């Protein structure tokens, strides 16, 4: 029932059945298989290039249940729901920390701290040497780090996040504000 999603979700009813036409477009993007795969699920959040494809493809780890390289429509609506322009920040704060914290041990170090600052130059169309990374990542943990330990904590990443607004702007999919009413385009190439 769509009424399980809804519930489950920051989705509607109605949000849940237009985004059931949004599944069959994504579905078919690549492999037309009534499923959805990395690449098709990089066209849904336009992170197909493949330096953008590093976040979209974590995001998808995340909602593959079976870790399978398959969702099906339900995994699809959670994977979505936490991108809608409404869903709590607090939501896009908690699940963009699990994003970076690979490793599940409630922190993040230098090498996560790299991901996040990659993926948050990538949506700025940025791409940077090496050496040059390590320089962010030397100011991010001046920033971040308030209690000295090494590592970014789930409340110090909170407070980052809400100093820094601009780093959550890849956990906002605008589309789906509108999306009763209309659908872009997903073409792949
Ligand atoms: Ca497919
Ligand atoms: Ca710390």
């Given at each position: 029932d769509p009424e399980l999603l809804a519930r489950d979700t920051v989705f509607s009813v109605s949000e849940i059945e237009a985004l059931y036409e949004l599944f069959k477009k994504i579905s078919s993007?690549?492999?037309?298989?009534?499923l959805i795969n990395k690449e098709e699920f990089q066209l849904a959040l336009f992170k197909t290039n493949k330096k953008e494809s590093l976040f979209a493809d974590r995001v998808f780890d995340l909602f593959?249940?079976?870790?399978?390289?398959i969702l099906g429509f339900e995994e699809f609506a959670r994977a979505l729901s936490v991108f809608?322009?409404?869903?709590?920040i607090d939501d896009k704060i908690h699940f963009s920390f699990q994003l970076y914290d690979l490793k599940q041990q409630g922190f993040i170090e230098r090498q996560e701290v790299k991901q996040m600052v990659v993926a948050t130059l990538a949506e700025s169309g940025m791409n940077l040497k090496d050496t040059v990374i390590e320089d962010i990542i030397d100011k991010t943990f001046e920033e971040?780090?308030?209690?000295?330990?090494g590592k970014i904590d789930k409340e110090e990443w909170r407070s980052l996040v809400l100093r820094?607004?601009?780093?959550?702007?890849?956990?906002?999919?605008?589309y789906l504000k509108d999306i009763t009413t209309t659908f872009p385009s997903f073409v792949f190439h």
């Open positions: 993007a690549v492999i037309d298989d009534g593959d249940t079976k870790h399978n390289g809608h322009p409404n869903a709590p971040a780090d308030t209690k000295h330990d820094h607004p601009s780093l959550l702007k890849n956990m906002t999919l605008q």
